[PDB]
Design a protein around this ligand. Structure first.
Ligand SMILES: Cc1cc(N2CC[C@@](C#N)(C3CC3)C2=O)cc(NC(=O)Cc2ccccc2)n1
Ligand SMILES: Cc1cc(N2CC[C@@](C#N)(C3CC3)C2=O)cc(NC(=O)Cc2ccccc2)n1
Ligand code: PRO
Ligand code: PRO
Ligand SMILES: [Ca+2]
Ligand SMILES: [Ca+2]
Ligand SMILES: [Ca+2]
Ligand SMILES: [Ca+2]
Ligand SMILES: [Ca+2]
Ligand SMILES: [Cl-]
Ligand SMILES: [Cl-]
Ligand SMILES: [Cl-]
Ligand SMILES: [Zn+2]
Ligand SMILES: [Zn+2]
Lengths: 481, 487
C-alpha cells in the first residue's frame, strides 16, 4: 500500500509510486536506476509508435559506437564547451591504461558526423536521415531523479543532413509534431510547443524547438522532447560538404538537424496522472489494460471458467488482458497490487454477478464502479478504455489551462509565479535580462519556450518586463526541472 | 564492383564486402565500428524473431544500468577473474576525478543479481525471467574484426532464476534451440549444438551449452551463441535466497541461467554466404528481397511513363503477398550502377523491366545466389518469385550444410588429428576432458594457431566405444569432442 501523499511530500510519493508499482529499482550506484519490465513496456509502446512514424518520413535505424575520441569531441567549440563538464571518460581497461582516454557519448553529434563527412561526396548522397535507440551518459553531480533527470538514460536520437535549408526546417517541425503526438496522443499529457530563447538553446545549434509539459503537483514545467536545427555549424567543423550542382568547384555545407526523446516521458506520465493510490496508466500505453479478478465446488470451477471466458473475448478484440486467477493471493491483495500498477480497468467476477450474467468494471482514473451485462463485454470495455484516455487528457488539460496565464509586469509576474503557476510575459530576449529575471524571482524562474501560439497578441510598443528594451515575444517562464 | 577475392585474401575480401555493401563504417577510434542501416536491419530481423519467441516462454524485457561498482564486480571471484583484464573503467567526469572508479558492464550478472536478491523473498517470487537488448564492452587489446570479435557490440542477454533445477535445465535447452533456429532457419547457417569443455565453459557457471558454426573459407569455427546453466554459484554469492513452507526454516538458493546472442551473427552470415560479387542475404532476413529496376529508359515520354507504371504494378503486387520489395526508380543513377549496387548488398532477386519485355508481358528475374536469369510470365510474378525466394533460402542452407558435412570428420589418433586439422577441417576426437590435456592439444597442434575445443556435440558423428582412450593416451575418453582452429 501507498503511504505518502502527493500534495504533502512530493518526492516521497514519487519514490513510493515508482517502486511499489515495480517500475523502478535502485542500483548500487546513486543516480543509476533499473527499469523493471512494467516501466520498460511503456518505453516499448512509445518506440513502436515513434519508430513506425519516423520510418514513414524516410528515416533509418543504425548503431554508432558509444565512445568518442578526444579530437572529434572538441571539433565544435560551443557544443564541447557546453557538454565537457559532464562527459564521462574511460582511461583504462583492467589495470592497463588506454593509449588515449576515450569519452562516453553524452549525445551522438561528434561520433556520427565524421562518418557523414565520409558518406557525403555529391548532392545526390543527400539527404542522410538516421536514428538510433541507445543509451547516453551525462555525468552531472546534481541531484538525479528517476526517469526525469538521470546520469545514464535511454533515448532515441535522430540526425539528418540536407542539401537545402528548406528541407531541414520542414523536418524540424515534422519531428516536433511527432513528439507532441507521443505526449498528447499516447501519454494523455498536454504540451506547449515553442522555441528556446538564445540562453536556453542547444549549444552549437541555430535554433531549438521543444515541447513543455506542466507538473501541477510541483508547479514546475519540464521539457519533454526537443528538435534542433543545427544549420551549418557542425558541417563546417566536420566538413560535411558537397560540390554545388550549378557552380563548378564550389563546396556547400550540408544543413543539419538533430532531435531527441527520452524515458523522461515515463516520469512525466507518472507525475501528471499518478494519484494517492498509485500509478495511473493511459490505456494507450498500458502493458495490461484489463485485469480479471475472481471474487467470493461446481461453482468455483464455473467462476474460473467464466473468468476465462472474459479473457478470451477481450483477447479476440485485441484488448490487452490478464486474468489473475492465482490461488496464492487474496482478492483484496490483488485489488491493491493492480491498482498500484495503474491498470486502467479492473474486471471483477463474483458468484452472484456470474449467475446473473453480469460483471463489474472499475475504472482506475476515477474509481467508479460500473455493472455491465456479459453481452456487452467487448464493446463497453473498449468504450471505457477510450473514455479513460480522454478523461486523463481532459483533467491534465484543465490544469494546464488554469496554471499558465499572462502577466505584463514584473510585480504580477512574481505574484503569479509563487502561487505555483507558469507565466507568459513580454520578453526582450536578451541573456542579461533572462539572468536578471532568474535572480529577481528567486528557485528562480527560467525561460521555458517562446510559444508558437501564445495566449495573447503582443501589442505595438509593448515593453519587456525589464522596462529597458521593447518586447520581442511573449515567452513562457516558470520553475523547471 | 568488388576487387579482392575470397579464396585469395580473406581479410581484404571481408573488409571490402562489409564496406561496399554499406554495412560497416570505420570509426575514428581504431578498432571501433559503425553499424549502418543495411547491417542494423539484419539485426532488427533477428531481434523480431527471437523477441517474439522468448516472450512465448514468459521472458520480459527490461533495462539495467551500464555501470558496475567495485563491490559488486568482485562478489563472484572466478567470473570477475575471467573478465577483469578487459573491463573498461570510468575514472573522471569532465576534469573531476571520481572518488571511486566505476566499471562498464562486460556482461550484466553483477549488475542484475543484487536486484534479484532484493526481489526474491519467497518461492512465489520465482521464476524471474528477464532479458535486455543492449551493448557491452570487452576491451581486449588483441586486434578486433568487424562483427566477429569487437570491443563493443550489441547483444541480448537473458537472465533467469528458478526455484527448482528441472525448470532451469529445461530453459537452457529451449533457448539453445532458439539460437539454432536463428542460425539455421533465419540465416541459413548450419550449427553444431554441444556443451563446452571444462576449460571453455563460463567462469563460475555449472555448465555451458553452445552452437558452433564453421567458416569454410578460413577453416575456422566460431561460437554463435551460448546458454549457461549457472546453478547456484551466483545465488550463493549474491544471497538470492527464498524460503518455502515445504522446507521449514531453510534458506534455499535460486537456480539460475544466463544466455546471450550478438551481432556476430551477421559476420557469420557474411563469412558463410558471401561470394566474390559481394554479400548474399538469405531471403528470410533480407531488408529487401526483390529490387525492381527499369532498364533501357533512354533519350517516347509516354512509353517511359508506362514503364514506370508497370514497375509500380510489380511493386504493389509483391507487397500484396508479403514480399519485401523496393523499386529503385531513381533517374540520377544508371541501370548498371543499380545492378552492381544491389548485388553488392546481396538482394536475393533483381527484377528487371525493359520496354520490349513490358510490351511482351514478361520480366526478367536474376537470383543473387546463382546468378541465373529467368524470363517470367508477368502473371506469375507473385507466385514464381515466392518460389524463387524459397529455393534461394534452401540453396544457401544446402550448400553451407554440405560444406560443414565435408569438413567435419572423426579421428582417434593425434597424427590423423594433425593431418586433418592442417587440411582446413574440424575434428571430433575422443577426449578425456581434462584442462591440462586441452592445453597440450593446443600447444601440440600449433607446431609439434593451435586447435581449440569447440563443443562436446549432443549428437556426435560416432558412438564412443566403451574403454576408448583419449587421444592423449593417458586417460579414458569421456566423450567425443569437436576441436578446431577458432575465432
Ligand atoms: C532522463 C534525462 C533527460 C534529460 N533531457 C535533457 C533535455 C532532453 C529533452 N527534451 C534531451 C534531449 C533529449 C531530456 O530528456 C536529461 C537528463 N540528464 C541530465 O541532464 C544530466 C543530469 C544528471 C543528474 C542530475 C541532473 C542532470 N536525463
Ligand atoms: C561480437 C563479439 C562476440 C563475442 N562473443 C563472446 C562469446 C559470445 C557467444 N556466443 C557472447 C556471449 C554471447 C559472443 O558472441 C565477443 C566479442 N568480443 C570480444 O571477445 C572482445 C575482443 C575484442 C577484440 C579482440 C578480441 C576480443 N565480440
Ligand atoms: O542532445 C540533444 O538535445 C540533441 C537531440 C538528440 C541528439 N542531440
Ligand atoms: O556473457 C555471457 O556469456 C553470459 C550470457 C549472457 C549474459 N552473460
Ligand atoms: Ca552542461
Ligand atoms: Ca483495496
Ligand atoms: Ca577473459
Ligand atoms: Ca555439474
Ligand atoms: Ca532459518
Ligand atoms: Cl472528467
Ligand atoms: Cl535588466
Ligand atoms: Cl601417467
Ligand atoms: Zn528585457
Ligand atoms: Zn586427454
Amino acid at each position: 500500500g501507498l503511504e505518502a501523499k502527493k500534495e504533502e511530500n512530493l518526492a516521497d510519493w514519487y519514490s513510493q509510486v515508482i517502486t511499489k508499482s515495480e517500475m523502478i529499482e535502485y542500483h548500487d550506484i546513486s543516480g543509476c536506476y533499473i527499469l523493471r519490465p512494467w516501466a520498460y513496456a511503456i518505453w516499448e509502446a512509445i518506440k513502436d509508435f515513434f519508430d513506425a512514424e519516423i520510418k514513414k518520413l524516410g528515416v533509418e535505424n543504425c548503431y554508432f559506437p558509444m565512445f568518442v575520441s578526444q579530437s572529434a569531441l572538441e571539433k565544435e567549440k560551443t557544443h564541447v564547451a557546453d557538454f565537457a563538464p559532464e562527459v564521462a571518460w574511460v582511461t583504462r581497461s583492467g589495470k592497463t591504461e588506454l593509449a588515449e582516454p576515450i569519452a562516453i557519448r553524452p549525445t551522438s553529434e561528434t561520433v556520427m558526423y565524421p562518418a557523414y563527412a565520409k558518406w557525403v561526396q555529391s548532392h545526390r548522397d543527400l539527404p542522410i536521415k538516421l536514428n538510433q535507440w541507445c543509451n547516453v551518459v551525462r555525468w552531472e553531480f546534481k541531484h538525479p531523479q528517476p526517469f526525469l533527470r538521470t546520469r545514464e538514460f535511454l533515448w532515441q536520437e535522430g540526425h539528418s543532413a540536407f542539401a537545402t535549408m528548406e528541407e531541414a526546417a520542414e523536418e524540424v517541425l515534422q519531428i516536433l509534431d511527432l513528439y507532441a503526438q507521443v505526449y498528447e496522443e499516447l501519454l494523455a499529457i498536454p504540451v506547449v510547443k515553442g522555441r528556446k530563447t538564445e540562453k536556453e538553446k542547444f549549444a552549437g545549434g541555430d535554433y531549438t524547438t521543444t515541447i513543455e509539459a506542466f507538473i501541477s503537483a510541483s508547479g514546475r514545467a519540464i521539457q519533454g522532447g526537443t528538435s534542433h536545427h543545427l544549420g551549418q555549424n557542425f558541417s563546417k567543423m566536420f566538413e560535411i560538404v558537397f560540390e554545388d550542382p550549378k557552380i563548378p568547384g564550389e563546396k556547400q555545407f550540408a544543413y543539419q538537424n538533430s532531435w531527441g526523446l527520452t524515458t523522461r516521458t515515463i516520469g512525466v506520465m507518472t507525475m501528471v496522472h499518478g494519484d494517492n493510490m498509485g500509478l495511473v496508466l493511459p490505456p494507450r500505453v498500458a502493458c495490461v489494460q484489463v485485469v480479471i479478478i475472481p471474487c467470493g465446488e461446481e461453482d468455483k470451477e464455473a467462476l474460473i471458467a467464466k473468468c476465462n471466458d472474459y479473457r478470451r473475448r477481450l483477447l479476440s478484440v485485441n484488448i490487452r488482458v490478464r486474468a489473475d486467477l492465482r490461488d496464492n493471493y487474496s482478492p483484496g491483495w490483488k485489488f491493491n497490487h493492480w491498482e498500484l500498477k495503474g491498470v486502467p480497468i479492473r474486471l471483477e467476477v463474483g458468484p452472484r454477478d456470474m449467475k446473473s450474467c453480469q460483471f463489474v468494471a472499475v475504472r482506475r482514473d476515477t474509481g467508479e464502479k460500473l455493472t455491465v451485462a456479459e453481452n456487452e463485454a467487448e464493446t463497453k470495455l473498449q468504450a471505457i478504455l477510450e473514455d479513460i484516455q480522454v478523461t486523463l487528457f481532459t483533467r491534465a488539460s484543465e490544469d494546464l489551462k488554469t496554471h499558465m496565464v499572462v502577466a505584463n509586469t514584473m510585480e504580477d509576474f512574481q505574484k503569479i509565479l509563487d502561487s505555483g503557476k507558469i507565466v507568459q510575459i513580454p520578453f526582450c530576449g536578451e541573456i542579461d535580462c533572462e539572468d536578471w529575471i532568474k535572480k529577481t524571482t528567486a528557485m528562480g524562474a527560467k525561460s521555458l519556450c517562446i510559444p508558437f501560439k501564445p495566449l495573447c497578441e503582443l501589442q505595438p510598443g509593448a515593453k519587456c518586463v525589464c522596462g529597458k528594451n521593447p518586447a520581442k515575444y511573449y515567452t513562457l517562464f516558470g520553475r523547471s526541472y
